[PDB]
Scaffold this active site. Structure first.
Site, PDB file in Angstrom:
ATOM      1  N   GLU A   1       0.397  -1.188   0.317  1.00 38.34           N
ATOM      2  CA  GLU A   1       0.056   0.412   0.268  1.00 38.34           C
ATOM      3  C   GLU A   1       0.973   1.391   0.340  1.00 38.34           C
ATOM      4  O   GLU A   1       1.620   0.895   0.773  1.00 38.34           O
ATOM      5  CB  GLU A   1      -0.837  -0.177   1.479  1.00 38.34           C
ATOM      6  CG  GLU A   1      -1.406  -0.786   0.969  1.00 38.34           C
ATOM      7  CD  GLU A   1      -3.081  -1.026   2.393  1.00 38.34           C
ATOM      8  OE1 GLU A   1      -2.897   0.257   3.216  1.00 38.34           O
ATOM      9  OE2 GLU A   1      -3.832  -2.090   1.988  1.00 38.34           O
TER      10      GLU A   1
ATOM     11  N   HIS B   1       8.315  -0.562  13.018  1.00 40.14           N
ATOM     12  CA  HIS B   1       7.202  -0.230  12.239  1.00 40.14           C
ATOM     13  C   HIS B   1       7.382   0.755  11.914  1.00 40.14           C
ATOM     14  O   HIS B   1       7.914   2.455  12.488  1.00 40.14           O
ATOM     15  CB  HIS B   1       5.705  -0.158  13.847  1.00 40.14           C
ATOM     16  CG  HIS B   1       4.904   0.310  12.841  1.00 40.14           C
ATOM     17  ND1 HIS B   1       4.108   1.577  12.705  1.00 40.14           N
ATOM     18  CD2 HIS B   1       3.506  -0.385  12.116  1.00 40.14           C
ATOM     19  CE1 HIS B   1       2.778   1.310  12.194  1.00 40.14           C
ATOM     20  NE2 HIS B   1       2.392   0.303  11.949  1.00 40.14           N
TER      21      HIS B   1
END
Ligand code: SF4
Ligand SMILES: [Mg+2]
Ligand SMILES: [Mg+2]
Ligand SMILES: [Mg+2]
Ligand SMILES: [Mg+2]
Ligand SMILES: [Mg+2]
Ligand SMILES: [Mg+2]
Ligand SMILES: [Mg+2]
Ligand SMILES: [Mg+2]
Ligand SMILES: [Mg+2]
Ligand SMILES: [Mg+2]
Ligand SMILES: [Mg+2]
Ligand SMILES: [Mg+2]
Ligand SMILES: [Mg+2]
Ligand SMILES: [Mg+2]
Ligand SMILES: [Mg+2]
Ligand SMILES: [Mg+2]
Ligand SMILES: [Mg+2]
Ligand SMILES: [Mg+2]
Ligand SMILES: [Mg+2]
Ligand SMILES: [Mg+2]
Ligand SMILES: [Mg+2]
Ligand SMILES: [Mg+2]
Ligand SMILES: [Mg+2]
Ligand SMILES: [Mg+2]
Ligand SMILES: [Mg+2]
Ligand SMILES: [Mg+2]
Ligand SMILES: [Mg+2]
Ligand SMILES: [Mg+2]
Ligand SMILES: [Mg+2]
Ligand SMILES: [Mg+2]
Ligand SMILES: [Mg+2]
Lengths: 208, 125, 84, 151, 84
Positions: free
Chosen positions: C46, C83
């Site tokens: 994405e 992350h």
RNA sequence: CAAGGAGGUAAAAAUGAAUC
RNA sequence: CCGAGGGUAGGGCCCGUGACUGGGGCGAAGUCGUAACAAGGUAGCUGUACCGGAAGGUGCGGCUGGAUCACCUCCUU
RNA sequence: UGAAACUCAAAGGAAUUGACGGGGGCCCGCACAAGCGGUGGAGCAUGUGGUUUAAUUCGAAGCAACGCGAAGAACCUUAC
RNA sequence: AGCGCCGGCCAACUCCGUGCCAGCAGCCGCGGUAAUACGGAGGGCGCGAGCGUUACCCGGAUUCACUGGGCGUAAAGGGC
């Protein structure tokens, strides 16, 4: 054909002994007097509460495994019993009891229904003079179920008739042990047979 | 509504709509593949789903799915369109049955081999 | 297609070789699929927004994200650990 | 003496600052298969506490079931809000033709054969309350002539 | 700077990764040395000539060569496996 | 002793980070 | 004489296709802004009309699917 | 007047508990205000980010990580 | 003697391989390290000369309501 294989596994899955072998069932090695828990690796596990469909399915399979029959003939007899005048449960039990192998088992010519089916199929059973090798012949009231003339000696059948000598037969049947014959008096009532099955669960199971 | 309304206008039936137009009322359709590739799935899932655009006997050119693990499908393979859709694939409403004209079954599979078209293995018994 | 490894991205990958091999196997496959189809494929790629605008994220593990950017001739790997 | 059967065990939720706070509900039916049946609904933060409280409430709220050898005397249609249940008497030898909740209710009340149907909303709580109110409105020929006698 | 791997070079790096563990550790020792000192370090830095001008070689083994090109912002690893 | 019937109201301060 | 059909001209309905073009939907997170949901920072929505990159803004009228929850102006102690 | 292809696995109504408001009413805390003394500027100490380096072992990451694990790293400690 | 299934609906459970890959799938959905839901095995369940799949019709669908539905706010009172 019919179910051929392990039988004590079927007796053990239902949790109720239903006499499918004969002498072994009366013996202390009935496999339920040793292991009264369902088969498989998970037999001794926690008994989970069965659903409503499970009770009716176990019930139907128990009644079907009592007489040793396939789902084709079982449902066909149920469909003939439902679309017929009278109480649908008792007429179903009476149509199931009118099967030739079942009456040969009741007369004591065999110690098991599978043995009686093999005896009928091999022409050792004679109905009203002529032999009938069909284990699905619906016996009508008044028929004389006997043994054929070539099949009179038969080392197996003499021990079975000697072992049946003394035991009384049901109220809907007659027996001439010395004459090697019997008679179908009438249809068995609901109170005459005391099968370990609740017929109402069987009727409400098939009514989907 | 009132009865006079029911006599005048009556009730409309339902006239349901087929979800498998390419089949044209046939259970199966033979079709020649033209494009064989892998596509990415829809919203809550990630994989590489193997599809094949099939120009079949009804003059239609529709995508189809290739179930199982691996296949032998090329640009000129004749397959058979079973039907049934894949939820996570857009525009894919059909299936390719295996064990057919050029879609060979999946090897080494041993549980559900009626589906995917795998012969009975004989460990010589 | 030319893989560009940043100072942080190369070290992150280097730590895994002496630490966890499976992660490397996952990154290698993602890189293998990415050069073939840069925007669709494994790891549910994405496009990233305002903080890392112009970059694409492919999941390694539910917490490790492979951040990358695409060019007509090369692939820049921003990170393969933590992350974003 | 009284057969206690549970049918619905659900988990509700209550919001509070920090997260979700649960509380369990239990719907049980008690009967004796002789014409006496009760229904209860209890709320407690644990499953056996809920079943115990539900059974205690079920033993309090009961109703007579005028059975006629194998079933109910007449047919009845009762609408409880958006749920509607239709009860019908059947001949001896058909079976309990009912869903989840009415089979569990009429089975403990002593009905051998019955013909039911769930209409409208199929909420198991409202279907249960509709079944209980429908069994409550059942009357026999002696009762109807007792009301239509005059005195 | 940064790491730039050629398609053939990345395959060679991966081929070694799935084949010999000793070689990948040795490969890593060399590349790290380059970054600190590009024309200095292990691998006997020796530059190529005529058509390979601007490319330097270091020897992981007696057979295999680590061919590279250094830039102010990047390093270009051409190969890390001497093809037959 | 209480309040209704009406009437004029802050601001220049925008957005969300990619394990549903 | 009628006549199968063949030919000529003019229509009607349907289907495929067409450079280009208009919107629709999907591709979990591209760019721009903050319109709506808390008086959502100018109550909201709506018919219409005009305008503006865009949501939208404004004019006229309408609706409650909003607002008298405190000082302080018009009429009462 | 008034569809279809295609698409979605829902769109919704009322009500409940919460959370929030540049909504309200009531009320607290060095929260504001009143009043002292400070940090940010300088030199040095210590910790962290960054970079460097063979290694600069690791963790902690707004409040509630940053003289924090060290209430004590010359080799010991010590994991590089 | 074979075929389907063994997350729930829906009768039937463990181990190993795999690791948001490969794959399942009718719906809700499962798979980014212990997966009763993928593949295999053991075991079990349902049928059995058959067992599953696909297409179509009816049923469930009182989701076209004659039996047997609705229109304040969910779709629905026509502006009068
Ligand atoms: S011996 Fe008879 S009763 Fe016992 S398990 Fe075997 S078949 Fe059943
Ligand atoms: Mg015979
Ligand atoms: Mg998934
Ligand atoms: Mg109603
Ligand atoms: Mg501003
Ligand atoms: Mg923005
Ligand atoms: Mg003509
Ligand atoms: Mg506003
Ligand atoms: Mg706004
Ligand atoms: Mg304004
Ligand atoms: Mg307007
Ligand atoms: Mg304007
Ligand atoms: Mg206005
Ligand atoms: Mg008006
Ligand atoms: Mg102050
Ligand atoms: Mg200072
Ligand atoms: Mg650590
Ligand atoms: Mg099945
Ligand atoms: Mg089950
Ligand atoms: Mg499967
Ligand atoms: Mg493992
Ligand atoms: Mg596992
Ligand atoms: Mg499944
Ligand atoms: Mg499995
Ligand atoms: Mg047959
Ligand atoms: Mg209908
Ligand atoms: Mg009607
Ligand atoms: Mg309706
Ligand atoms: Mg509305
Ligand atoms: Mg409406
Ligand atoms: Mg009106
Ligand atoms: Mg009009």
């Amino acid at each position: 054909g019919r179910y051929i294989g392990p039988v004590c596994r079927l007796c053990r899955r239902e949790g109720v002994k239903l006499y499918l072998k004969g002498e072994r069932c009366y013996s202390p090695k009935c496999a339920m007097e040793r292991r009264p828990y369902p088969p498989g690796q998970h037999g001794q596990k926690r008994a989970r509460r069965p659903s409503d469909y499970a009770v009716r399915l176990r019930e139907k399979q128990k009644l079907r495994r009592i007489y040793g029959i396939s789902e084709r003939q079982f449902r066909n007899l149920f469909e003939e019993a439902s679309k017929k005048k009278g109480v649908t449960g008792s007429v179903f039990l009476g149509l199931l009891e009118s099967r030739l192998d079942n009456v040969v088992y009741r007369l004591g010519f065999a110690v098991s229904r599978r043995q009686a089916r093999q005896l009928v199929r091999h022409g050792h059973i004679t109905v009203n003079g002529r032999r009938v090798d069909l284990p699905s012949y619906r016996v009508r009231p008044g028929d004389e179920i006997a043994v054929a003339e070539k099949s009179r000696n038969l080392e197996l059948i003499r021990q079975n008739l000697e072992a049946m000598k003394g035991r009384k037969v049901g109220p809907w049947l007659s027996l001439d042990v010395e004459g090697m014959k019997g008679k179908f008096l009438r249809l068995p009532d609901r109170e005459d047979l005391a099968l370990p099955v609740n017929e109402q669960l069987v009727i409400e199971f098939y009514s989907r | 509504p009132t009865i006079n309304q029911l006599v005048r206008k009556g009730r409309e039936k339902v006239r349901k709509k087929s979800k498998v137009p390419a089949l044209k009322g046939a259970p199966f359709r033979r079709g020649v593949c033209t494009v064989v590739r892998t596509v990415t799935p829809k919203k809550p899932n990630s994989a590489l789903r193997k599809v094949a655009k099939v120009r079949l006997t009804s003059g239609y050119e529709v995508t189809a799915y290739i179930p199982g693990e691996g296949h032998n499908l090329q640009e000129h393979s004749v397959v058979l369109i079973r039907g049934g859709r894949v939820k996570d694939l857009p525009g894919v409403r059909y299936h390719i049955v295996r064990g057919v004209y050029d879609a060979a079954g999946v090897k080494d599979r041993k549980k559900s081999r009626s589906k995917y078209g795998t012969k009975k293995p004989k460990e010589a018994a | 297609m030319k893989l560009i490894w940043s100072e942080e991205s190369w070290d992150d990958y280097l730590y895994w070789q002496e630490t966890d091999k499976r992660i490397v196997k996952k990154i290698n496959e993602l890189i293998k699929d990415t050069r073939r189809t840069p925007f669709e494929g494994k790891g549910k790629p994405e496009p990233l927004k305002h903080n890392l605008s112009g970059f694409w994220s492919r999941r390694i593990t539910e917490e490790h994200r492979l951040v990358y950017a695409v060019t007509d001739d090369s692939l820049l790997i921003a990170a393969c650990r933590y992350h974003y | 003496d009284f057969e206690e059967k549970m049918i619905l065990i659900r988990r509700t939720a209550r919001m509070q600052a920090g997260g979700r706070r649960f509380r369990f509900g239990a719907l049980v039916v008690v009967g004796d298969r002789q014409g006496r049946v009760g229904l209860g609904f209890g709320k407690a933060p644990e499953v056996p506490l809920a079943v115990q409280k539900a059974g205690y409430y079920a033993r309090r709220n009961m109703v007579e079931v005028p059975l006629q050898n194998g079933t109910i005397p007449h047919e009845i249609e009762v609408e409880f809000g958006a749920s509607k249940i239709v009860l019908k008497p059947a001949a001896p030898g058909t079976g309990v033709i009912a869903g989840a909740v009415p089979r569990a209710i009429l089975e403990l009340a002593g009905v051998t054969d019955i013909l039911t149907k769930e209409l409208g909303s199929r909420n198991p709580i409202n279907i249960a309350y509709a079944t209980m109110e429908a069994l409550r409105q059942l009357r026999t020929k002696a009762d109807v002539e007792r009301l239509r006698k005059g005195e």
